[PDB]
Amino acid sequence: ENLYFQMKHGRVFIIKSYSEDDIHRSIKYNIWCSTEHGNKRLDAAYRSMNGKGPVYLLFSVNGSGHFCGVAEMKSAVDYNTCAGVWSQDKWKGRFDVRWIFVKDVPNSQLRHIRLENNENKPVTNSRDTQEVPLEKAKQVLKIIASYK
Numbered sequence: 001e002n003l004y005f006q007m008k009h010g011r012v013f014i015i016k017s018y019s020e021d022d023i024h025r026s027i028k029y030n031i032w033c034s035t036e037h038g039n040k041r042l043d044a045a046y047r048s049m050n051g052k053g054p055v056y057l058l059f060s061v062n063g064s065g066h067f068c069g070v071a072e073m074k075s076a077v078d079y080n081t082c083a084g085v086w087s088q089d090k091w092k093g094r095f096d097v098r099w100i101f102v103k104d105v106p107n108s109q110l111r112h113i114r115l116e117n118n119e120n121k122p123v124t125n126s127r128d129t130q131e132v133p134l135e136k137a138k139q140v141l142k143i144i145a146s147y148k
């Protein structure tokens with residue numbers, strides 16, 4: 001048995017990127033940037049958590065059919081940083097992450113987990129910075145950590 005994830009202090013968000021280059025850059029330098037409202041959502045979650053548990057980011061490239069890994073948020077959002085470092089030159093800001101897990105996990109392994117906060121749509125049908133309820137997040141993390 002593996003009962004690790006079945007902890008009650010953490011928040012988990014889907015990260016959806018159009019750009020494979022951004023993913024590579026994120027892994028290399030341990031940074032990310034979302035949209036304006038996405039950054040705001042993540043920033044509120046990180047500040048409200050106050051170190052008492054992780055903010056997890058589940059990364060997936062739009063159209064790829066799989067998730068590509070997991071990172072933990074490691075800083076609040078700095079909104080005034082060098083522009084043009086990402087795919088689209090109009091992302092504003094930057095925060096630190098630590099990539100915790102880098103591998104492809106097909107959507108088939110996850111489509112049966114549904115998000116009651118998103119009309120019961122499959123977690124694999126989520127938009128950028130969709131938050132995942134903790135009880136569903138535990139199931140997602142378990143499947144990702146044990147896919148071979």
Ligand SMILES: CNC(=N)c1ncccn1
Binds near residue numbers: 019022034035087
């Ligand atoms: C670097 N940021 C991204 N590649 C992104 N893509 C879609 C929504 C939010 N962010």
